PDB file of C-alpha atoms and ligand atoms in Angstrom:
ATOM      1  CA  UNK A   3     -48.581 -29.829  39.483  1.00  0.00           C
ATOM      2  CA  UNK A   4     -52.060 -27.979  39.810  1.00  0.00           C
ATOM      3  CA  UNK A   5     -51.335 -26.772  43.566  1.00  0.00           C
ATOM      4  CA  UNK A   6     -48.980 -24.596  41.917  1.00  0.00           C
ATOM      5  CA  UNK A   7     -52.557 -22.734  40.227  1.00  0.00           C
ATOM      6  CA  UNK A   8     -53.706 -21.728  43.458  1.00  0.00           C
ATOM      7  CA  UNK A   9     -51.141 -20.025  45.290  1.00  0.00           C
ATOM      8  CA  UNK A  10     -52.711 -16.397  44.622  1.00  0.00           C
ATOM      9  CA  UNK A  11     -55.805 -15.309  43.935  1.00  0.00           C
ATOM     10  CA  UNK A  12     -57.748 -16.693  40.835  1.00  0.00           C
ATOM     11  CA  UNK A  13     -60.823 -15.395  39.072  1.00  0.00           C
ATOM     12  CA  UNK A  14     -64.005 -18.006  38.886  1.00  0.00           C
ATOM     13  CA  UNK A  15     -66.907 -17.937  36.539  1.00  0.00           C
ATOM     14  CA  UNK A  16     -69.694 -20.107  36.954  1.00  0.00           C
ATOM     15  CA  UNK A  17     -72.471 -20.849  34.492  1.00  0.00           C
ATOM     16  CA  UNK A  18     -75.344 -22.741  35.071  1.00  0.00           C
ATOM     17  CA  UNK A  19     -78.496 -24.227  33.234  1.00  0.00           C
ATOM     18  CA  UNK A  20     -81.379 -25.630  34.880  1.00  0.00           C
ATOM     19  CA  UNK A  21     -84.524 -27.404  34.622  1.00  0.00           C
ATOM     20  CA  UNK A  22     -86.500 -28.047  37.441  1.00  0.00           C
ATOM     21  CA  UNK A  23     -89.539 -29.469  37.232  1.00  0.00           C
ATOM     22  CA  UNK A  24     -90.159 -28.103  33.766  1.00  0.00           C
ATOM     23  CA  UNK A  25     -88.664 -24.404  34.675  1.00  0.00           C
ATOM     24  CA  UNK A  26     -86.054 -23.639  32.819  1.00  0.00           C
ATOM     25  CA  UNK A  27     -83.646 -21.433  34.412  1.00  0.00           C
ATOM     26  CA  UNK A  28     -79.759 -19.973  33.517  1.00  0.00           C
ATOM     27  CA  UNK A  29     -77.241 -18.438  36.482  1.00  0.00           C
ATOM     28  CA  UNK A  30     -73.982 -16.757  35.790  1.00  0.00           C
ATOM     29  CA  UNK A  31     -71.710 -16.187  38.532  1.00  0.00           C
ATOM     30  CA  UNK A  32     -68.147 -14.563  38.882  1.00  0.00           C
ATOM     31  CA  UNK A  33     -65.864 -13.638  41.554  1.00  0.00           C
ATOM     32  CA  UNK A  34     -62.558 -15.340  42.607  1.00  0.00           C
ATOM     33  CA  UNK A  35     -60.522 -17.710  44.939  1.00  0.00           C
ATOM     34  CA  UNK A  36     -57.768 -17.861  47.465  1.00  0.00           C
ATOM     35  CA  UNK A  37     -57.529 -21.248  48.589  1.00  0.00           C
ATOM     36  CA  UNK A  38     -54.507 -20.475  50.636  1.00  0.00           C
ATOM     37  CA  UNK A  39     -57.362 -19.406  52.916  1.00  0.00           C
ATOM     38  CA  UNK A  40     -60.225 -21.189  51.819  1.00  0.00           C
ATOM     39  CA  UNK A  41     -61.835 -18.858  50.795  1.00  0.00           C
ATOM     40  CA  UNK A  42     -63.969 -17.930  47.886  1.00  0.00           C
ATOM     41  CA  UNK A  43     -66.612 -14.950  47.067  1.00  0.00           C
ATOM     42  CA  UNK A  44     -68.945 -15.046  44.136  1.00  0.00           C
ATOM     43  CA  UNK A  45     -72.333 -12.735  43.179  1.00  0.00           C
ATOM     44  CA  UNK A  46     -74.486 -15.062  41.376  1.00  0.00           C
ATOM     45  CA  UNK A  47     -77.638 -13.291  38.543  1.00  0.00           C
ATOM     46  CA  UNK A  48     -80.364 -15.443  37.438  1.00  0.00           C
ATOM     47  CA  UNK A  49     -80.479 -14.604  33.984  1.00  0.00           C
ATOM     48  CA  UNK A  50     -83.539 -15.623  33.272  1.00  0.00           C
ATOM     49  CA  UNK A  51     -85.679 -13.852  35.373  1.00  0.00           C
ATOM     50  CA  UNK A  52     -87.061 -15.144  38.854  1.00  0.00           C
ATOM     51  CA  UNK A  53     -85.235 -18.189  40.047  1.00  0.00           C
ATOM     52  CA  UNK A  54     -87.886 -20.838  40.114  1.00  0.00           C
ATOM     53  CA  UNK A  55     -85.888 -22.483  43.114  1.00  0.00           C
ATOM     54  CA  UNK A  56     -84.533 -21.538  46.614  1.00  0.00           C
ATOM     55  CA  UNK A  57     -81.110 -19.575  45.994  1.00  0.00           C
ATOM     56  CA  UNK A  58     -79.728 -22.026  49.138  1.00  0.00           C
ATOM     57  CA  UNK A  59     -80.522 -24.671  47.420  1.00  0.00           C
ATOM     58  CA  UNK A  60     -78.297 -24.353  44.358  1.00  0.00           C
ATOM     59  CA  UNK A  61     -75.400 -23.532  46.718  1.00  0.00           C
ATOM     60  CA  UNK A  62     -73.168 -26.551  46.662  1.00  0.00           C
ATOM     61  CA  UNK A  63     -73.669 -27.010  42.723  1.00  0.00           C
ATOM     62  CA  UNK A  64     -72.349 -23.224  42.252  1.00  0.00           C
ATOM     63  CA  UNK A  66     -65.367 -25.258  42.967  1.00  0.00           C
ATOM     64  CA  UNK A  67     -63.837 -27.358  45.413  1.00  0.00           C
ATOM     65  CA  UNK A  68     -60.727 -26.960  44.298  1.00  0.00           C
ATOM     66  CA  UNK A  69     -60.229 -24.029  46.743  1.00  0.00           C
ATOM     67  CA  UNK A  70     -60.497 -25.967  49.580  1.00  0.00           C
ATOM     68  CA  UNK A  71     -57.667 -25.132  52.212  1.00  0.00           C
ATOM     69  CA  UNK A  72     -55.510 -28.500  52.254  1.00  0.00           C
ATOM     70  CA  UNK A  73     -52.973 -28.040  55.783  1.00  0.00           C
ATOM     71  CA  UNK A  74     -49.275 -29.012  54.471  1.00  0.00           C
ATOM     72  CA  UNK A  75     -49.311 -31.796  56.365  1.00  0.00           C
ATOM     73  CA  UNK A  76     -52.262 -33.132  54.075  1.00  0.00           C
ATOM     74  CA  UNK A  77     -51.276 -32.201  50.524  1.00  0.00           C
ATOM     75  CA  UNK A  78     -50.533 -35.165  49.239  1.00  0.00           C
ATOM     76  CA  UNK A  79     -54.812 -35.454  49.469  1.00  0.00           C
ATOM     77  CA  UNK A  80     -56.225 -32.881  47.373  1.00  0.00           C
ATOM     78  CA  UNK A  81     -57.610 -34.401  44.528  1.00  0.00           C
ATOM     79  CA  UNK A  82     -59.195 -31.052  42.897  1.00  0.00           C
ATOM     80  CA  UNK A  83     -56.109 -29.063  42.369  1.00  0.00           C
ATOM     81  CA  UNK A  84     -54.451 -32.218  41.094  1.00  0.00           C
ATOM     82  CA  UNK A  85     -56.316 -32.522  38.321  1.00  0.00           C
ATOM     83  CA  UNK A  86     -55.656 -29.097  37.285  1.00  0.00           C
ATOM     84  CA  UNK A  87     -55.395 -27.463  34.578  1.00  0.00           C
ATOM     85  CA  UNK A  88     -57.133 -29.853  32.648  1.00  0.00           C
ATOM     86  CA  UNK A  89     -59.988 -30.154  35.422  1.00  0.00           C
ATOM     87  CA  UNK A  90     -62.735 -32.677  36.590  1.00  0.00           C
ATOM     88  CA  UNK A  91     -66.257 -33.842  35.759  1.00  0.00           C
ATOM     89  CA  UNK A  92     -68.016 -33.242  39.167  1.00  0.00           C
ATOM     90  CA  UNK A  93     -71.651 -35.079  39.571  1.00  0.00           C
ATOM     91  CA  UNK A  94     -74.017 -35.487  41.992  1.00  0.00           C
ATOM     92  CA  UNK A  95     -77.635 -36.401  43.328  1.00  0.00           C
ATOM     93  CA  UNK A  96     -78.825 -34.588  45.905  1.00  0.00           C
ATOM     94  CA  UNK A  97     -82.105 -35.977  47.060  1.00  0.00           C
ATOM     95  CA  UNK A  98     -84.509 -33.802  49.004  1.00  0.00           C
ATOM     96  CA  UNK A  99     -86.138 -35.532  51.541  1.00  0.00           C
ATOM     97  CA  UNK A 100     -89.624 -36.315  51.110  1.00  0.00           C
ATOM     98  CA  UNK A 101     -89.314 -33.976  48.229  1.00  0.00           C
ATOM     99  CA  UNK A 102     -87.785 -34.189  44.804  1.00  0.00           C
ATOM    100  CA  UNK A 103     -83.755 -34.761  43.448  1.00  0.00           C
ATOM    101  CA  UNK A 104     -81.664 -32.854  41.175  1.00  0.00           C
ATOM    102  CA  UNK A 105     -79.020 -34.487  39.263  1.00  0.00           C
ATOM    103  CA  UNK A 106     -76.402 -32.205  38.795  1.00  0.00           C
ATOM    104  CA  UNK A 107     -73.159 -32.455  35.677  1.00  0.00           C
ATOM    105  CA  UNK A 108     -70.271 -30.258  36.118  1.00  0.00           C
ATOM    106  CA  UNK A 109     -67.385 -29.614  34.338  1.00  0.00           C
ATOM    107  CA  UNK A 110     -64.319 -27.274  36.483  1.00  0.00           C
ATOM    108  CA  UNK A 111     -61.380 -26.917  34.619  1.00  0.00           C
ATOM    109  CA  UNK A 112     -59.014 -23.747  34.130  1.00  0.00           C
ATOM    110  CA  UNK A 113     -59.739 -21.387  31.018  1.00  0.00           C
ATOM    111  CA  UNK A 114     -56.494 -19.562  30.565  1.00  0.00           C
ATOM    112  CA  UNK A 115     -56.182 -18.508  34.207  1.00  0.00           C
ATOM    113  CA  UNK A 116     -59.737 -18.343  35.147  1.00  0.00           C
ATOM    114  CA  UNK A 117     -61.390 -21.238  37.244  1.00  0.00           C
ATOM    115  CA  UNK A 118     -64.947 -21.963  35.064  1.00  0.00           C
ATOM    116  CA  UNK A 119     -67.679 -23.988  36.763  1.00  0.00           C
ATOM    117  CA  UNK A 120     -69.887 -25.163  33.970  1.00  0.00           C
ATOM    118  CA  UNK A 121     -73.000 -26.751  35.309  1.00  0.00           C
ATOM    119  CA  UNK A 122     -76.045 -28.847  33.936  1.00  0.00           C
ATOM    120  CA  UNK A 123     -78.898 -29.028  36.963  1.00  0.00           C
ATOM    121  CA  UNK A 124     -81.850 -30.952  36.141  1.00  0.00           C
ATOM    122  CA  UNK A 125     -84.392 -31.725  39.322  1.00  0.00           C
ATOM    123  CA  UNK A 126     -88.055 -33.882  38.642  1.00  0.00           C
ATOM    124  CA  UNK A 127     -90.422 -35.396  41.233  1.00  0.00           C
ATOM    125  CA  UNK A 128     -90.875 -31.885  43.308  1.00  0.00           C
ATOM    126  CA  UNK A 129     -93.685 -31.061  45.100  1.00  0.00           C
ATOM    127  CA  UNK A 130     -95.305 -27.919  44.070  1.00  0.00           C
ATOM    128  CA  UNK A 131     -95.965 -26.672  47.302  1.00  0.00           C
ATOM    129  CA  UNK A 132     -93.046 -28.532  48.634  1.00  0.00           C
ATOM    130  CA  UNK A 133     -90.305 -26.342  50.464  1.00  0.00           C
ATOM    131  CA  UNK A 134     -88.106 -25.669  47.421  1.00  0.00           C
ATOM    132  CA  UNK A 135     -91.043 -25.423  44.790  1.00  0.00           C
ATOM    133  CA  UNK A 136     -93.034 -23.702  47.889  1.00  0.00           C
ATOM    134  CA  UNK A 137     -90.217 -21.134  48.502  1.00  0.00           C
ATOM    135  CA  UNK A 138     -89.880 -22.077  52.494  1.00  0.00           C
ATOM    136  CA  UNK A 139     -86.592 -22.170  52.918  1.00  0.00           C
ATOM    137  CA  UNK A 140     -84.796 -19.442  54.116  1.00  0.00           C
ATOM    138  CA  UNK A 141     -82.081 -17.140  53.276  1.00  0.00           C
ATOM    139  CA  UNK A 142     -79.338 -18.559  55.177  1.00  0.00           C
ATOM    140  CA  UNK A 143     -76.909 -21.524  55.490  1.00  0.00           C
ATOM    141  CA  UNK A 144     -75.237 -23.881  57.661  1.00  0.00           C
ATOM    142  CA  UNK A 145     -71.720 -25.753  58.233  1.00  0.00           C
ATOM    143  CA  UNK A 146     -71.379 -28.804  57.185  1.00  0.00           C
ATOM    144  CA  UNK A 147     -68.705 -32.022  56.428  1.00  0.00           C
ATOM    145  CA  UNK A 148     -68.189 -32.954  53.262  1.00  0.00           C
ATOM    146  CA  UNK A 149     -67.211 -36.954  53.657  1.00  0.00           C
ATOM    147  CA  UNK A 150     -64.421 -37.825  50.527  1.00  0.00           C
ATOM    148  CA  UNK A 151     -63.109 -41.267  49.944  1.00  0.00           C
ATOM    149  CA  UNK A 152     -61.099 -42.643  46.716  1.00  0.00           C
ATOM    150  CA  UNK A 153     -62.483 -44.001  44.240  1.00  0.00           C
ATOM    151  CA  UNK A 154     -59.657 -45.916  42.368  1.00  0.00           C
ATOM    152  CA  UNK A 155     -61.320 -47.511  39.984  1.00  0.00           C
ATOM    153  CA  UNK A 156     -62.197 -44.304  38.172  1.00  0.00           C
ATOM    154  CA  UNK A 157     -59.112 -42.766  39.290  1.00  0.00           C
ATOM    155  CA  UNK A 158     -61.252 -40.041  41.322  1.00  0.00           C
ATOM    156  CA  UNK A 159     -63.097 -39.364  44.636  1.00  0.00           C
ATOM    157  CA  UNK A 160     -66.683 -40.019  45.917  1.00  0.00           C
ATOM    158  CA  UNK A 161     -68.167 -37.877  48.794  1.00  0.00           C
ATOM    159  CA  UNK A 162     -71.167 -38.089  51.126  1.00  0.00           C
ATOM    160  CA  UNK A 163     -72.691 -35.603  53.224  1.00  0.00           C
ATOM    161  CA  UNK A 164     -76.178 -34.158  54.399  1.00  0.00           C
ATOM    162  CA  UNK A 165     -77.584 -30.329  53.609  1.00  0.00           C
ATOM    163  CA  UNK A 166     -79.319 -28.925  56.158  1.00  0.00           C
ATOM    164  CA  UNK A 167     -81.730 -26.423  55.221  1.00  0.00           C
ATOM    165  CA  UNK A 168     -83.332 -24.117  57.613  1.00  0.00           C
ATOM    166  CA  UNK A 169     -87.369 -23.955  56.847  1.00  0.00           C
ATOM    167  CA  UNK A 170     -89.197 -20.594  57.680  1.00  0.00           C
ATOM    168  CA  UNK A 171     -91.399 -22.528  60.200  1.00  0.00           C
ATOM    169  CA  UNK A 172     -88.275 -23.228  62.387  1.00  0.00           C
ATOM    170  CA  UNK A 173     -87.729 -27.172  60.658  1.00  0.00           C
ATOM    171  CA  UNK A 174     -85.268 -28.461  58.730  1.00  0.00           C
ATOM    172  CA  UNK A 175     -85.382 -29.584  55.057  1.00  0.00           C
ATOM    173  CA  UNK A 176     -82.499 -32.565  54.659  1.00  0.00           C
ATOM    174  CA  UNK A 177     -80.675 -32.496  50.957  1.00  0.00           C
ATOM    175  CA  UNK A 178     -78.458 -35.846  51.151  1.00  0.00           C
ATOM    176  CA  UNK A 179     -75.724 -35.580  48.453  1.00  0.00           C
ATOM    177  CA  UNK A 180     -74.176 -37.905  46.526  1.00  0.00           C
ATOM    178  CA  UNK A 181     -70.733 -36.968  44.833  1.00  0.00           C
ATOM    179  CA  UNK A 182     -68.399 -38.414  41.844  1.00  0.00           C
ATOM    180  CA  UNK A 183     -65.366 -36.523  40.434  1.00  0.00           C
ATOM    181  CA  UNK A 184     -62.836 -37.988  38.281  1.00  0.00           C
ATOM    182  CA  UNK A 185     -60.420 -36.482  36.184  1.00  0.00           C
ATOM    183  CA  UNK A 186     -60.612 -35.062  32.596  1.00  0.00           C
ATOM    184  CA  UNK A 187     -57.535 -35.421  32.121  1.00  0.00           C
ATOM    185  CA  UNK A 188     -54.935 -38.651  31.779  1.00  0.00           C
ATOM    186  CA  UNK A 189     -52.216 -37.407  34.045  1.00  0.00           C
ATOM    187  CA  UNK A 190     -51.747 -38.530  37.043  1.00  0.00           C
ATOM    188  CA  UNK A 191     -53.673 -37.175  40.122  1.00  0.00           C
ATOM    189  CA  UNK A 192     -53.887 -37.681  44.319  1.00  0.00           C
ATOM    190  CA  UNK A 193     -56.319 -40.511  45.628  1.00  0.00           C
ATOM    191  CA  UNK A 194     -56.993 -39.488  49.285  1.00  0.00           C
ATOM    192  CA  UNK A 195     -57.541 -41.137  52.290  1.00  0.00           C
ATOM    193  CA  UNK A 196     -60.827 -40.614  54.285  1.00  0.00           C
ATOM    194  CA  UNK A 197     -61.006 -36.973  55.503  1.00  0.00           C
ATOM    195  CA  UNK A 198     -63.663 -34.100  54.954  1.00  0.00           C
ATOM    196  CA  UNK A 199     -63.909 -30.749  54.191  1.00  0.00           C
ATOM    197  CA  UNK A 200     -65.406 -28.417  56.546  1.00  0.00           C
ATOM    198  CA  UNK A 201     -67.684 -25.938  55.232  1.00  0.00           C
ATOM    199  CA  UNK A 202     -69.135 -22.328  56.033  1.00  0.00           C
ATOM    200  CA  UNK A 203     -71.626 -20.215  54.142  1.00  0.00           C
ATOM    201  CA  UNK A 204     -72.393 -16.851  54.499  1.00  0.00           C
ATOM    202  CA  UNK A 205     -75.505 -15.570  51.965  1.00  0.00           C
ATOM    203  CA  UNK A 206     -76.234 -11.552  51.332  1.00  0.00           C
ATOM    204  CA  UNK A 207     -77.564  -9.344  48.646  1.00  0.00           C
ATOM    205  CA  UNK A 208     -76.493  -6.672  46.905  1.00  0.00           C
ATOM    206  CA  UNK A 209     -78.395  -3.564  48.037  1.00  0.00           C
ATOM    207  CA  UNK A 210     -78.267  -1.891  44.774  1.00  0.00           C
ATOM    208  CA  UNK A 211     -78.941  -5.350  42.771  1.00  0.00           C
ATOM    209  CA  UNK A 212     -82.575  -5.450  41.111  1.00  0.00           C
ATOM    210  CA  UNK A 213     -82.119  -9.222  39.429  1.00  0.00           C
ATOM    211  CA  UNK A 214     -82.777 -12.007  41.120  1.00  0.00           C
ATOM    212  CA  UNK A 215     -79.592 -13.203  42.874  1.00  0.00           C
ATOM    213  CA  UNK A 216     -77.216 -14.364  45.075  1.00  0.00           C
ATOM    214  CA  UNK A 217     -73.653 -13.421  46.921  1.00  0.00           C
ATOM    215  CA  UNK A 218     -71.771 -15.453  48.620  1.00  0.00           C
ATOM    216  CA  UNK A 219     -68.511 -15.618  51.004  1.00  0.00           C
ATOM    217  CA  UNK A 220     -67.462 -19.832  51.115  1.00  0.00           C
ATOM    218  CA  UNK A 221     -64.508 -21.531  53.879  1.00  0.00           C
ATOM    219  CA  UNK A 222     -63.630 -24.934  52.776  1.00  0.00           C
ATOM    220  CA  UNK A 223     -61.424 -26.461  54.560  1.00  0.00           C
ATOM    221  CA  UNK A 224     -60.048 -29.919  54.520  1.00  0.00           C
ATOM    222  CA  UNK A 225     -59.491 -31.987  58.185  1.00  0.00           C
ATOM    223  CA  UNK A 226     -59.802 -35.666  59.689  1.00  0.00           C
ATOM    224  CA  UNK A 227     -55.923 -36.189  59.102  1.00  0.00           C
ATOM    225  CA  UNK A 228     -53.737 -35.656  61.977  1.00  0.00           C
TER     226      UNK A 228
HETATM  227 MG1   MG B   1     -84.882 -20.828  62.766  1.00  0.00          MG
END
């Protein structure tokens, strides 16, 4: 069963490309996972150069899967079920008042390494918008990440809202819209309603000169008693 994947700690790599409004862009990321705790750390480099986009904003496409599930709600983790063989894991997220990315992702395990592969492309952004603009700010809030089955694709759907702090004290809303289903054709778990809660914690690297990111990450799974 893919619980059994995640009892220790496991390496991640994430790789993304991007295009966003025309700017093409390229992120690596590595670090690792303990979802015993819920708890993951990554430094993320844009490869490229400058990121063309907000580092927050990118956040919740840069691995679910090491989300702390209590025992006594197990039987609803989807993402380590589908393990090793992984899950296709898309959204939109639409900026309000602003533009939308539509994000492709593909988490599976290679050997014992958790790889995040990501395709990101956003259109329709302002250019002096907050995320073409470069408002927001360097920080990150707690959120609930809504998940409900989806059993006729033999996967999960989740809903929630990004809020984005703005340098001018407002907030920029990102609503999400999720889809993951299996790559796989074993069998996985089909939850009932719950949510993840979330935490963020952004920093730099003093002695980093790229462009980038690091990043401590709680998810933890509630809403079952
Ligand atoms: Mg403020």
């Amino acid at each position: 069963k893919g619980e059994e994947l995640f009892t220790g700690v496991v390496p991640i790599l994430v790789e993304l490309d991007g295009d966003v409004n025309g700017h093409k862009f390229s992120v690596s990321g590595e670090g690792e996972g303990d979802a015993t705790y819920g708890k993951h750390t990554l430094k993320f480099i844009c490869t490229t150069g400058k990121l063309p986009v907000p580092w927050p904003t990118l956040v919740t496409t840069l691995v679910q899967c090491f989300s702390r599930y209590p025992d006594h709600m197990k039987q609803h983790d989807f993402f380590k079920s589908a393990m090793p063989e992984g899950y296709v894991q898309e959204r939109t997220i639409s900026f309000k008042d602003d533009g939308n990315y539509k994000t492709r992702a593909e988490v599976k395990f290679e050997g014992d390494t958790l790889v995040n592969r990501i395709e990101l492309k956003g259109i329709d952004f302002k250019e002096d918008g907050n995320i073409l603009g470069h408002k927001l700010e360097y920080n990150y809030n707690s959120h609930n990440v809504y998940i409900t089955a989806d059993k006729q694709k033999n996967g999960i759907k989740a809903n929630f809202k990004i809020r984005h702090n703005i340098e001018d004290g407002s907030v920029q809303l990102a609503d999400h819209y999720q889809q993951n289903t299996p790559i796989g054709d074993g069998p996985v778990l089909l939850p009932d309603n719950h949510y993840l809660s979330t935490q963020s914690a952004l920093s730099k690297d003093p002695n980093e000169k790229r462009d980038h990111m690091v990043l401590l990450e709680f998810h933890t799974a509630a809403g079952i008693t």
